[PDB]
Design a protein around this nucleic acid. Structure first.
Length: 55
DNA sequence: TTAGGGTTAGGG
DNA sequence: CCCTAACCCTAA
C-alpha cells in the first residue's frame, strides 16, 4: 500500500467534523462525511498533525 | 473505540 | 536523502 497525502477537502471535512461533533468523536466524524480510504484512527492522527501545523 | 507513544515511507 | 506526515500498537 502507498500512503496518501491528505487533500485540502479531506482536512476541511475533518475540521468541520470537530466543530460539529467534538474532538475525539472520530468515528462519528468519519460517518458524517464521504471519507474514502480513511479510518477513524487516520482522522485522529491527522487532527494531531493539523494541530501541530496550526490548522 | 480513542489517546498517546512508537514506526516508516515518500515527498520537500 | 532523510525528516516528518502518514502510518501502527495497544492500554484502558
Amino acid at each position: 500500500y502507498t500512503r496518501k497525502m491528505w487533500s485540502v477537502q479531506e482536512s476541511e471535512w475533518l475540521k468541520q467534523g470537530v466543530v460539529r461533533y467534538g474532538v475525539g468523536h472520530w468515528e462519528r466524524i468519519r460517518s458524517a462525511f464521504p471519507f474514502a480510504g480513511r479510518t477513524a484512527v487516520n482522522l485522529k492522527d491527522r487532527w494531531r498533525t493539523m494541530v501541530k501545523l496550526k490548522m
